[PDB]
Amino acid sequence: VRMNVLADALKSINNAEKRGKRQVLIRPCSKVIVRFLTVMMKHGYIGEFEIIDDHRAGKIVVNLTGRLNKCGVISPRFDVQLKDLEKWQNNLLPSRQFGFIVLTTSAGIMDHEEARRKHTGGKILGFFF
Amino acid sequence: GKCRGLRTARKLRSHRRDQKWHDKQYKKAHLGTALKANPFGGASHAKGIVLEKVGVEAKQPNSAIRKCVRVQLIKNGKKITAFVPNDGCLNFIEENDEVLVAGFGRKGHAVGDIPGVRFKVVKVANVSLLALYKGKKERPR
Amino acid sequence: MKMQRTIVIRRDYLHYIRKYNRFEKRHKNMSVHLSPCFRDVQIGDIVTVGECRPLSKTVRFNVLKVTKAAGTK
Amino acid sequence: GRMHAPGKGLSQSALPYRRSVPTWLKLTSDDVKEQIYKLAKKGLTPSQIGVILRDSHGVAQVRFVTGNKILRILKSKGLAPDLPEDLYHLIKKAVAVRKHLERNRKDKDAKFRLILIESRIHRLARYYKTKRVLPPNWKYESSTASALV
Amino acid sequence: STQPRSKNESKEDKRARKQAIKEERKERRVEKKANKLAFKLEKRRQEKELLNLKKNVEGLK
RNA sequence: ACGGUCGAACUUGACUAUCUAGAGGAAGUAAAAGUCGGGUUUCCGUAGGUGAACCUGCGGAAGGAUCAUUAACGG
RNA sequence: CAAGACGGACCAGAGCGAAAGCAUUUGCCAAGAAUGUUUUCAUUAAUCAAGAACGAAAGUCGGAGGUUCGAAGACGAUCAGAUACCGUCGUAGUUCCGACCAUAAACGAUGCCGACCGGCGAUGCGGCGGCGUUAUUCCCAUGACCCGCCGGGCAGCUUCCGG
RNA sequence: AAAGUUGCUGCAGUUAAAAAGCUCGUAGUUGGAUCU
RNA sequence: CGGGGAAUCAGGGUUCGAUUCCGGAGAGGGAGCCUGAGAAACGGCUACCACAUCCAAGGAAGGCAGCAGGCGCGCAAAUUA
């Protein structure tokens, strides 16, 4: 069955970005997906999107800018401490200049850099570059 | 594929040890049937008594007679065949002689032309075969 | 709740395995003394126990309070 | 896909976005509720009541008109059956298959389909025991099943 | 039994002939199993002897 | 000294496990140039044929090299 | 005239079934997919150690029956050395009923559930929209065709998607 | 350590070693939106 | 024997840890004691089991897994200062 809707959304975004498309339809929607796309938007990676608000779980159509190489989820959502965030960013990210571990902390869903700034740890969600 | 849940630790480690038993070197090291079939009994070297001298015929593409020796080890009574390396070095060996033997290099596997020899003679009558061959020392009897 | 004036409770937890970075589910059973002041205790409800001196061969804790099951009214 | 079949079909309903009662529907919630009460007194499961209300009386959805769904109205007034509708239908189907297998012994497919029906019955019984709809001591037994229906 | 089965034979002849055939097959399979066991035992002892010749008593002197 | 307690150990049979002498049997090996001398494409499972191989029966595979024809049919 | 067997051609890259498999008429019996639904329940789900039903052919026990075929077996041919091939006969078996067995190249030599990434039109079932031909112009719906569209199927062709 | 030839990171399972004949099913594992 | 720890290692890991520090256990094997604040103590006692010393043949005395040293064992390890 459908488990982990964030994985489906990120895979659909990756597959249609690799194909050269301009817009992606991802269904279902969730708060986690919207937060991930908001973080990924603030770094100028994806563009802007609409949440089609049907009375079910919504849909999202997201515009695509050709700036994305790989957006991905980490399943399971491992616990990450600040002492162990360096190993994760060494494992997943192509370079020290760019790429993003997204993680959920009690201060919200953010990047690894904002997690270092706010001195928080949490559970890993993804990475994009 | 593989299980990747946050609660799959015992499944992963149990499957790891079960498939670890399918590794040949792991099963040689840990089952304990190769260690009791090994004549040295987990020793680098063993010391035995020369029973007889043997000409072992080399395997098919090479034509030679390799000078080996049937030795009985002192500590367990097992019988092995040990190769005497250099030329004329079998003449330094007599029957019923005290001989230090080591493995030959491939960890219990036969080496090169010689069929079924895992061992080589290191010392004869408590003097090395190297010093006898190079003529540095003399052998008692 | 089958032997006289003492009961068997189960404590569940996750034990961490560092190689795989995962957890496994583990449990331990404890025989704990149940006083007759806690009557109409059923199976599957939460109990808070406190450590005391040994009372028998296996009993080391004593029931302090009883909170009913999640579904039981 | 299906629970016990290889099929993966898409046959299902599609409710509209519009939750409001249509302006042509001149029926209050009380009239629909008394209609549900008299259909239950005639004797019908909530699926049948919903179908009759949809086909003839123009009631598109009961819970858009009254605010409540049919089985909750029946339970609130007190005409709900003791066992649920789907569990009742599954047990009835199992009883019919058992009768056929009593008549015909060599029918292996009837045995296989009976095993599937019992699996579905046990799944539903476990689910209803978790939700305190059935008593915890409830059980499906081979011999006394036609007495339940 | 190597006999043709004609049409005039009835019960208590056909069933006796069938039972004789079934007995023949039964001790035939017993003898087959015994032969399998004997050949297996002989193969194991001769492989033991061949490996003994590989280990020792094989050389010139 | 009676009694009790803790209890080493001793004897008798069974279950055994290990160490250590053996008449004999069946073998192999080194020594005797001593005596006599055509079929198959490739398989699988089961059964029979003297054990296996192999052949046949039954049921399965290809992991075996598709040329030529095919628009009317209404009165 | 009787006996047992088998349901050809129609029969297809068609259909059904969890797989093994399934083809003469009619009736009875309980099942089932798909489609259609502005029906109901509301997470009841997926994959599954243990455990459990089914499982070609061959084979084994009891009974029945033995048309054809037919392992074994008996003959006849065939040759420096033929003892497999070939032909005639033929036992177990091949058929049915009730018990066992649980194996196949039991194959797509390809786990199941879920998502996304090119295209095209044939077919099977269901549904929808239709100008027309036909049931000797049919009096109205309905069946057979014709043109599309949707959903689940058995498959196919095409492609420098990527491997 | 080389061994990503024990693979959690991180291996394989058409033809090279390898997916159970098939389905059900308990423990185990995993489990769709939704509440500032 | 267990830890502190050690070798190797990108990251994850694999393997070692009899061995001087902390804890436990035992003085050939078992068992039972006396004294004492503290031992079921062994450079204390009493037995049995296995070894083994001096005998005038009645008796007596033993316990190096302390330090050196010896035999044996072994591929394998030091001075009776």
Q: How far apart are the first and last CA of chain B?
A: 69
The domain tally of chain D equals: 2
- Resolution reached, in Å? 3.0
The integer distance in angstroms from the CA atom of D146 to the C1' atom of G62 is 37
Same domain, yes or no: D85 and D136: yes
Same domain, yes or no: D145 and D106: yes
Query: Pick from D122, D125, D118: which is nearest to D97 by CA?
Result: D118
Identify whether the C-beta of residue B107 lies closer than 8 Å to the C-beta of residue B101: no
CA angle, D49 then D50 then D52, to 5°: 65
Q: Do D19 and A54 touch (CB under 8 A)?
A: no
Segments forming the whole domain that contains residue D54: 26-80
Is C18's CB less than 7 Å from nucleic acid strand H?
A: no
Residues in chain C with CB shorter than 8 Å from the CB of B15 are: none
Residues in chain A with CB shorter than 8 Å from the CB of D17 are: 54-55
Same domain, yes or no: D74 and D90: no
- One-letter amino acid identity for D38? K
The integer distance in angstroms from the CA atom of D97 to the C1' atom of G4 is 36
Identify whether the C-beta of residue D91 lies closer than 8 Å to the C-beta of residue D142: no
What is the separation of C-alpha E23 from the centre of its chain, rounded to a whole number of angstroms? Answer: 15
What is the number of CB-based contacts under 8 A between chain A and chain D? 4
Same domain, yes or no: D74 and D97: no
CA angle, D56 then D62 then D66, to 5°: 125
Experimental method: cryo-EM
CA angle, D25 then D26 then D32, to 5°: 85
* Measured CA distances, B85 to A79, B65, B104, E20, E26 (Å): 61, 12, 10, 72, 63
Residue C64 sits at φ, ψ, to 5 deg, of -100, -45
CA angle, B122 then B27 then B80, to 5°: 30
Q: What are the tokens at A112?
A: 């690894």
Handedness of CA E46, E51, E56, E59 (dihedral sign): positive
Q: Which chains touch C (3 or more CB pairs under 8 A)?
A: B
- One-letter amino acid identity for A17? E
The integer distance in angstroms from the CA atom of D109 to the C1' atom of G4 is 30
* Measured CA distances, A5 to A16, A19, A56, A72, A105 (Å): 17, 21, 14, 12, 19
| CA atoms in the 13 A half-sphere facing the CB of D109 | 0
Query: Pick from A59, A65, A51: which is nearest to A17 by CA?
Result: A65
Q: Which chains touch B (3 or more CB pairs under 8 A)?
A: A, C, E
Same domain, yes or no: D39 and D103: no
Quote helix, strand, coil % in chain E, to nearest 5: 70, 0, 30
Return d(Cα B21, Cα B29) in angstroms, integer: 10
Question: Nearest nt (C1') to D53 (CA)?
Answer: G39
Q: What are the tokens at E14?
A: 């056909």
B8 three-state secondary structure:
coil
Q: Any CB–CB contact under 8 A between A57 and chain D? A: no
The domain tally of chain A equals: 2
Q: Quote the minimal CA–CA distance from B8 to chain E in Å.
A: 46
Segments forming the whole domain that contains residue A114: 69-129
Residue E47 sits at φ, ψ, to 5 deg, of -70, -35
Contacts of C58 (CB under 8 A, 6+ apart): C31
Helix (H) or strand (E) holding C29: strand C22-33
| Residue D110 resides in a domain | yes
**What is the dihedral angle through the alpha carbons of E40, E42, E48, E50, rounded to the nearest 10 degrees?**
-120
Same domain, yes or no: A100 and A57: no
CA angle, B20 then B23 then B26, to 5°: 80
The integer distance in angstroms from the CA atom of B47 to the C1' atom of I53 is 37
Handedness of CA B94, B96, B98, B100 (dihedral sign): positive
E12 three-state secondary structure:
coil
Same domain, yes or no: D107 and D145: yes
Residues in chain C with CB shorter than 8 Å from the CB of B7 are: 14, 22-25
**What is the dihedral angle through the alpha carbons of A101, A104, A105, A111, rounded to the nearest 10 degrees?**
30
- Write down the H helix ranges in B31-139: 34-37, 129-133
Question: Nearest nt (C1') to A87 (CA)?
Answer: I11
Q: Do E54 and B55 touch (CB under 8 A)?
A: no
CB atoms within 10 A of CB B70: 19
Same domain, yes or no: A78 and A122: yes
Same domain, yes or no: D89 and D148: yes
At a 7 A CB cut-off, the residues bordering strand F are E 25, 28-29, 31-32, 35-36, 39, 49, 53, 57-58
Same domain, yes or no: D62 and D75: yes
In the listed set A36, A53, A68, which residue is the last one of a domain according to the structure?
A: A68
